[PDB]
Design a protein around this ligand. Structure first.
Ligand SMILES: [K+]
Ligand SMILES: [K+]
Ligand SMILES: [Zn+2]
Lengths: 363, 149, 228, 126, 42, 292
């Protein structure tokens, strides 16, 4: 009884010639869900495209209308206004942009509406969860920030929401959206240093009445499954003890795996799925969205595993013959491994940051 | 068979250039011609000056015209305009800081409206603080991506 | 005159050169900015916000025109004979193109040739044929029941001699609507089966031919099994 | 003279071409087939109760058939999808298999006898 | 077979000399064929 | 393996080496941060057997290369042996004057690159030996460092392949011991430099000149200056000079880069000595040393 949103069109969009972000990856996921016969254990839905009045509760109407009117072949009149909204270089303009944004935001708002009305406990929208887009400009491959809309929907019934983020990059759009409120708490586990977006410092914990209600866990290179677990379980446990969330939005970016295009971590499929296990084990209403992920064979396999494990099933190790099978050679297994990349987190460092966090959380 | 490199010399142009050297009565004139070409390559020899010296070495009008056609010469008033970039692409870093990265907003930027906001979202969402990431200046030890497999 | 041709080509390349370019051999690493380090082989892709730089200066492509078609090429791993580069620095080392793309010329080579043998070891037909049977069977379990109801409604049922509307009391104007919809359903369900059966039988024809060839090109090594 | 194996070299390309068309179509089917199974089991139970008329006797025969009618009306748009997909797959595989068959007709000719009938002494023939 | 045999030689030569060849390029139709098609559609 | 090997190969590029030394020299000449002139590279070479180890590895690899014909192997082995023994002085109240006179070598970019490579190879071998000995796990064996040497010897002749090599290396679990594989690369670059010198017809006199200056007792300036003028003349009018000085007392190698009007000896203990050396230079040196 897991709501699983999926629109068939989202896999036909195309960012640009050699761009790293391919929505096609989502389609690959579905193509393994069907051939793994998980189609029958899931309540599969088709998202209602979000209107324009739905998308301008976070964003501004000027930015959303610009997104509406623009077009890749009639942007000789928009070319001046392009970079006023950060559009153009790594957030390009492509054919059918507004459709893609409406698809993803509609999936997220639909999941929130499923959870509001008791129709399920766990919802899945693998083609949403774009956490970088800001209120008045695109930012780092994301144009509209659907997660803020999902949370604004959840807050109608529930009273306190928790947004957990395990994308290697920082979730800056979401954190900046709810930075001065206590009703939503953001928690991010991100590589820090000389890295995108360069925010996310361990002393940035909200303002106003939001003081203490954010959590930034600045890690370093090469981190692996055991260290990640050792710093993930204590903080999550104390947040659930002291914050007492009612709804959980879990962001499942997969550029934190070993071998990614733009990643510097060393997790593996087991190390990544441990987080989903541990957050599920609290028996809460849980939306579970996608995120980063730029080596698409890894993304497909890991997201398939996490869906089969969120439902409650036990998928085989081998891979069922499907259309995108040859992407997964030469082994053809549902496993993503890790490499001998050298860790850079000394145990003393992890314990220091963990203690500083937990001492912050006691208020 | 043999592969054609990108922008490889075509046969017509090689023929024409060897006839140019042949009209040049000397191997010293041919060497001077190579010197002209090289000095144009090394950003010490202009375009029109290359054409002028080429003509004063070839003393033939049709070859001057063929060169000016190969050089892709065009005399037009080069127009240079300087347009500043929009205020919003750099203005953030003049805002009164609050923390390392969060900077208070000025009143002129809290003057645009989102039209789908009800009474809830006007009390949950953050309105007046931005997140201005920090800017490197002169990085001087750049890391690469080394795994080539 | 080869040196002269090289000179002419070099001059043509200089004319061809773009208005803005990268001259320094060192490329821009991650580096997350272009200030200071412009003219750095890829610094046009970098600025303030710059998620990253995905295109490194090792996959860059150079086009060479052969005959009538242009073929790109990865030219960072050329022979480029030098002291610094070892052979095992080349990813595409020991990938022999001349023997991967080569023809057979000998029937038994079917079982040793690298690429071809990797082709006769896939069992994608035997999976698809069984999937087709699994799909046909459920549909047929449904069609059999539709068909029984049909022979009842028409009236050609040996065990039901009376009028069908009577044997399950309904107005004779309800029986006609029911019969119409049942007829549509039964006809469509029969057509789907008739097509999927042709699909499956042709898959089986392919499987039969494949095994026959695997058994021919084994000569005296023919032990009944033909799983490569 | 000496013979290249042109047919035996095209056979190996046809044998690869065959699965892909139907691969796409098979998956597109499994989706539809899996979003219709509950309705089909409904229909089977309904036909059974209407045709036995003596084993599950809790109904009013006028309504016991209005339910079957509505259920049959529900399943109708899926049969059209299945028919379109089956005809597409049929055409694709037909062309591919015509090619493969025309090839195998020849690959059996330019292959030495001893390679398909064995040596004239490895035949029992009592 | 002749076409494959020609392509193999071309690619082995291009391999030794220049680099390692990537996938065949996906190009448009010819100028002549575009012309004829715009004609018969016109 | 990939980070180490990539950073390595990206480090020892000819032009990169030259640009590094040039940048340091330019920063000195103008006193940008208060840095005054002098030496731009300094390093101590203690052991004398490590050089024989390096010679062993070099000959091992040289018998298994495929660029050079049968005689170039002998040529290159000889040249390496000669430049090792002569310069580095490795055996292959009236006596301290030697250890007080630093021996001088003048060459061009090729020589500077060659010597930078040799110092790098030495440093890495020595760090290896120190880590095998001081670390109390593999030191417990009689010849763990020696086992490493014998294994590398095996591999470089073609008697062992690279997979066994790398998996055996993984036993040490050490980046410091990851650094052993780079020796093949370093040796390849070295052989290349040496060969391009053996074809450099201006080499002979140069190294011959070196031989000549390996016979004096303690030099007066004028001899060194006329040596330097010889060298500077043998090259084209455009070139730089690289000065490599050997202190056998401290067993220290120092390297600097000299342009036309530069001082060869930077330290004078009294103004009279300075004036003496100047006048000598004005006499002989092609361009007066020490003038702006
Ligand atoms: K908050
Ligand atoms: K994060
Ligand atoms: Zn990310």
């Amino acid at each position: 009884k897991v709501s699983y949103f999926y629109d068939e069109d989202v896999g036909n969009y195309h960012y640009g010639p050699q761009h790293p972000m391919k929505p096609h990856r989502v389609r690959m996921v579905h193509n393994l869900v069907v051939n793994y016969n998980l189609y029958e254990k899931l309540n599969v839905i088709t998202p209602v495209r979000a209107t324009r009045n739905d998308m301008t509760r976070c964003h501004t109407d000027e930015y959303i209308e610009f997104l509406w009117r623009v077009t890749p072949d009639t942007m000789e009149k928009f070319q001046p206004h392009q970079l006023k909204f950060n559009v153009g270089d790594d957030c390009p303009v492509f054919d059918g942009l507004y459709e893609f944004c409406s698809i993803s935001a509609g999936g997220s708002i639909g999941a929130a509406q499923e959870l509001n009305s008791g129709n399920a406990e766990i919802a899945i929208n693998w083609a949403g969860g774009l956490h970088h887009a800001k209120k008045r400009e695109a930012s780092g491959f994301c144009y509209v920030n659907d997660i803020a809309l999902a949370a604004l929907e959840l807050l109608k019934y529930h009273q306190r929401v928790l947004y957990i983020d395990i994308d290697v990059h920082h979730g800056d759009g979401v954190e900046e959206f709810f930075y001065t409120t206590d009703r939503v708490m953001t928690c991010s586990f991100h590589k820090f240093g000389e890295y995108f977006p360069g925010t996310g410092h361990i002393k940035d914990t909200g303002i106003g009445t939001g003081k203490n209600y954010a959590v930034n866990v600045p890690l370093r290179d090469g981190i692996d499954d055991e260290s990640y677990e050792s710093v993930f379980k204590p903080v999550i446990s104390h947040i659930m003890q002291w914050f007492r969330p009612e709804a959980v939005i879990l962001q499942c970016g997969t550029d934190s795996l070993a071998g990614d295009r733009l990643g510097c971590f060393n997790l593996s499929m087991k190390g990544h799925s441990m987080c989903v296990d541990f957050v599920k084990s609290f028996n809460l209403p849980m939306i579970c969205v996608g995120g980063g992920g730029y080596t698409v064979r890894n993304v497909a396999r890991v997201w398939t595993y996490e869906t089969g494990l969120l439902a409650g099933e036990e998928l085989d190790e081998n891979l069922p013959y499907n259309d995108y099978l040859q992407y997964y050679g030469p082994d053809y297994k549902l496993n993503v491994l890790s490499n001998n990349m050298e860790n850079h987190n000394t145990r003393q460092y992890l314990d220091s940051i963990t203690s500083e966090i937990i001492e912050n959380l006691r208020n | 068979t043999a592969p054609t490199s990108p922008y490889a010399a075509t046969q017509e142009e090689l023929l024409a250039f060897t006839t140019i050297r042949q009209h040049l009565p000397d191997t010293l004139a041919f060497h001077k011609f190579l010197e002209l070409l090289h000095l144009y390559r090394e950003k010490l020899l202009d375009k029109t000056e290359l054409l002028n010296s080429f003509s004063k070495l070839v003393r033939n009008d049709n070859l001057t015209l063929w060169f000016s056609e190969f050089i892709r010469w065009s005399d037009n008033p080069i127009l240079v305009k300087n347009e500043p970039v929009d205020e919003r692409v750099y203005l953030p870093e003049t805002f009164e800081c609050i923390s390392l990265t969060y900077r208070k907003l000025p009143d002129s930027w809290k003057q645009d409206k989102c039209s789908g906001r009800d009474d809830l979202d006007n009390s949950v969402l953050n309105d007046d603080y931005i997140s201005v990431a920090p800017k490197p200046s002169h990085v001087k030890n750049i890391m690469h991506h080394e795994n080539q497999y | 005159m080869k040196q002269f041709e090289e000179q002419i080509e070099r001059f043509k390349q200089a004319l061809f050169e773009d208005s803005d370019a990268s001259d320094s051999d060192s490329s821009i690493g991650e580096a997350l900015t272009n200030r200071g380090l412009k003219r750095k082989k890829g610094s046009k892709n970098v600025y303030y916000g710059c998620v990253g730089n995905s295109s490194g200066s090792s996959i860059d492509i150079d086009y060479y025109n052969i005959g009538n078609t242009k073929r790109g090429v990865v030219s960072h791993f050329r022979r480029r004979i030098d002291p610094e580069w070892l052979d095992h620095d080349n990813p595409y080392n020991d990938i022999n193109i001349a023997e991967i793309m080569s023809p057979l010329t000998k029937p038994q080579d079917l079982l040793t040739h690298p690429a071809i043998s990797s082709i006769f070891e896939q069992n994608y037909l035997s999976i698809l044929a069984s999937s087709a049977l699994e799909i046909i069977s459920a549909e047929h379990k449904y069609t059999a029941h539709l068909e029984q109801l049909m022979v009842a409604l028409l009236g050609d049922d040996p065990s039901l001699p009376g009028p069908p509307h009577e044997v399950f009391g309904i107005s004779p104007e309800q029986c006609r609507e029911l019969t119409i919809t049942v007829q549509e359903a039964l006809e469509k369900s029969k057509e789907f089966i008739r097509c999927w059966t042709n699909v499956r039988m042709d898959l089986l024809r392919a499987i039969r031919f494949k095994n026959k060839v695997i058994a021919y090109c084994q000569g005296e090594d023919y032990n009944g099994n033909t799983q490569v | 003279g000496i013979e290249i194996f042109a047919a035996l070299n095209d056979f190996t390309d046809a044998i690869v071409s065959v699965p892909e068309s139907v691969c796409g179509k098979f998956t597109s089917l499994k989706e539809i087939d899996a979003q219709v199974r509950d309705i089909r089991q409904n229909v089977i139970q309904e036909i059974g109760v209407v045709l036995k008329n003596e084993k599950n006797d809790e109904l009013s025969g006028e309504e016991r058939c209005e339910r079957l009618q509505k259920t049959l009306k529900e399943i109708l748009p899926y049969s059209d999808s299945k028919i379109c997909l089956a005809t597409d797959a049929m055409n694709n595989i037909k062309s591919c298999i015509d090619r493969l068959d025309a090839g195998f007709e020849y690959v059996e000719l330019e292959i030495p006898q001893q390679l398909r009938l064995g040596y004239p002494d490895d035949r029992a023939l009592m | 077979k002749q076409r494959i045999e020609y392509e193999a030689a071309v690619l082995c030569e291009l391999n030794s000399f220049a680099g390692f060849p990537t996938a065949p390029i996906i190009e448009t139709a010819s100028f002549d064929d575009i012309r004829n098609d715009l004609l018969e559609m016109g | 393996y990939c980070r180490i090997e990539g950073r390595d190969r990206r480090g020892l590029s000819y032009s990169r080496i030259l640009r590094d030394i040039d940048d340091i020299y330019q920063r000195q000449k103008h006193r940008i941060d208060g840095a005054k002139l002098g030496f731009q590279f300094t390093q101590v070479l203690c052991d004398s057997l490590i050089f024989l180890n390096i010679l062993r590895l070099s000959d091992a690899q040289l018998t298994n290369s495929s660029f050079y014909s049968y005689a170039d192997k002998g040529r290159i082995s000889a040249v390496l042996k000669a430049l090792l023994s002569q310069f580095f002085g490795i055996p292959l109240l009236g006596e301290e004057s030697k250890n007080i006179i630093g021996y001088n070598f003048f060459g061009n970019a090729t020589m500077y690159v060659l010597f930078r490579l040799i110092c790098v190879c030495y440093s890495r071998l020595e760090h290896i030996k120190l880590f095998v000995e001081s670390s109390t796990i593999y030191a417990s064996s009689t010849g763990g460092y020696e086992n490493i040497l014998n294994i590398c010897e095996k591999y470089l002749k073609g008697s062992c392949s690279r997979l066994e090599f790398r998996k055996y290396l993984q036993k040490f679990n050490n980046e410091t011991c990851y650094m052993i594989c780079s020796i093949e690369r370093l040796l390849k670059v070295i052989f290349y430099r040496i060969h391009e010198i053996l074809l450099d017809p201006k080499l002979g006199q140069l190294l011959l000149l070196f031989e000549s200056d390996g016979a004096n007792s303690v030099t007066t300036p004028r001899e060194q200056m006329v040596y330097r003028n010889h060298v500077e003349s043998i090259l084209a009018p455009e070139s730089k000079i690289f000065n490599m000085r050997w202190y056998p007392l401290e067993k220290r190698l120092c390297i600097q880069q000299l342009l036309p009007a530069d001082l060869t000896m930077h330290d004078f203990e009294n103004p009279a000595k300075a004036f003496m050396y100047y006048v000598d230079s004005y006499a002989i040196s092609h361009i007066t040393e020490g003038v702006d």
